[PDB]
């Protein structure tokens, strides 16, 4: 109802002669034209979307994901969308700065160089999760990891803790938590808890909207990276997204074990590998949560295929989660490749000694030891100094 009221108000205001302003993310269709979707509707096709002529797209070399803000006009007799007259701001910047840009496909990838420390530093009991995460698997800019965990392991609490630690330590980073095929109540809870942008697509609509929202989000992330921004995407839907792609892919006659199409894992693997660290400027970090032991062999095949792709695995133990010990992290199975590029020599040596001491002990025993050692102090520096 609000959209029709705004439409009528804008019409009455344009009848007087005043200017009308709009904003939205561009979604170029296959025919050549596009529309400016809205953020409050999770990039959903609305009746009051702003039409974008192909002439302006050719003039400014606009692509899917470009945030466009400019003057619009109400539709005339025979039109159903707002025509874009003049664009004022492109991607929160002037068009003269966006015209001389380098495409995302030409950026040179690199390994994680900058250290994104997750430790809060306030000495809270909730900071233990971030401390264990930093001790087990340090995360840097451009990291491409996977949160491997069975159902009912603590993915929600761990994701909330990660989001809060990111918003606390690194408020300059653009945090985007894209939740696909999840409960609406959980979406509402997350949106009113984390300090950032929350786009979601619940199961109430088919997988086409899921794929469309995923494409819009990845295009916006690529454009922001092109504009020298540090984008961090926490997509806890990678398994759901792979299921959606396998459901919407045309049959090719080559079905793998478990009901997986031969060309179904192409789009999600490309979405995952899109994350990379750019040397010219900016980075893209994608932390996804994979589902295992869900009773379906399709998810097992998806996990086994995506295991050889990322460079960071955070395994969670079902036993430790059932014992109500959070975070229930499998320290032995966790780790990060090329960790010497994110940690110093002494920090790497301390982590190596801690792993050599923890490995002989059992999972529950190692977790109890780590908790008892971290409870004695507030910062990990005192723990490191006492271990020696």
């Amino acid at each position: 109802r609000k959209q029709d009221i705004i439409f009528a108000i804008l019409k009455q205001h344009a009848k007087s002669g005043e200017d009308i302003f709009g904003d939205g993310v561009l979604e170029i269709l296959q025919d050549g034209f596009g529309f400016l979707r809205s953020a409050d509707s999770s990039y959903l096709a609305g009746p009051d979307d702003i039409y974008v002529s192909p002439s302006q797209i050719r003039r400014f070399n606009l692509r899917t994901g470009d945030t466009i803000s400019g003057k619009i006009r109400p539709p005339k007799e025979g039109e159903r969308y707002f025509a874009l007259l003049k664009v004022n701001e492109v991607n929160f910047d002037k068009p003269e700065n966006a015209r001389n840009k380098i495409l995302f496909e030409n950026l040179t990838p690199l390994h994680a160089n900058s250290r994104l420390r997750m430790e809060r530093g306030n000495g809270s009991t909730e900071d233990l999760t971030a401390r264990v995460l930093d001790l087990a698997s340090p995360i840097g800019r451009g990291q491409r990891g996977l949160i491997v965990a069975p159902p009912k392991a603590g993915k929600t609490m761990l994701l909330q803790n990660i989001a809060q630690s990111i918003a606390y330590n690194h408020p300059d980073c653009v945090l985007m938590v894209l939740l696909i095929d999840e409960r609406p109540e959980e979406v509402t809870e997350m949106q009113r808890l984390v300090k950032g942008e929350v786009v979601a697509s619940t199961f109430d609509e088919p997988a086409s909207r899921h794929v469309q929202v995923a494409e819009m989000v990845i295009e916006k992330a690529k454009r922001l990276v092109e504009h020298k921004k540090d984008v961090i995407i926490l997509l806890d839907s990678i398994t759901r997204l792979a299921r959606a792609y396998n459901t919407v892919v045309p049959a090719s006659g080559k079905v793998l074990t478990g009901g997986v199409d031969a060309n179904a894992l192409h789009r999600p693997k490309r979405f995952f590998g899109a994350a990379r660290n750019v040397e010219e400027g900016g980075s893209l970090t994608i932390i996804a949560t994979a589902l295992i032991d869900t009773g379906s062999k399709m998810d097992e095949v998806i996990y086994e295929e995506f295991k050889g792709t990322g460079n960071m695995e955070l395994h969670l133990s079902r036993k430790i989660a059932e014992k109500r010990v959070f975070p229930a992290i499998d320290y032995n199975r966790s780790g990060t490749r090329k960790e010497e590029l994110l940690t110093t020599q002494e920090e790497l040596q301390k982590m190596w000694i801690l792993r050599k001491i923890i490995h002989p002990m059992g999972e529950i025993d190692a977790m109890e030891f780590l908790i008892n050692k971290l409870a004695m102090t507030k910062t990990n520096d005192d723990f490191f100094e006492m271990m020696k």
């Binding site: 049959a251 006659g253 079905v255 009901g259 199409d261």
Partner: protein, 50 residues
């Protein structure tokens, strides 16, 4: 679902949406069959009658 075609390929049991398109005799006309010819495209395997 791409899983049902895998099952159809596992066993020799037929399973498809069969529509009848057989050649029938028009009304009024009759007679006795005196000759039957069968022409098969190259590569395709012949059948019992052929």
């Amino acid at each position: 679902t791409p899983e049902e075609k895998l099952l159809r390929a596992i066993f020799g049991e037929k399973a498809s949406d069969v529509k009848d398109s057989s050649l029938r005799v028009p009304n009024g006309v009759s007679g006795t069959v005196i000759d039957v010819q069968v022409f098969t495209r190259d590569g395709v395997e012949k059948d019992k009658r052929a």
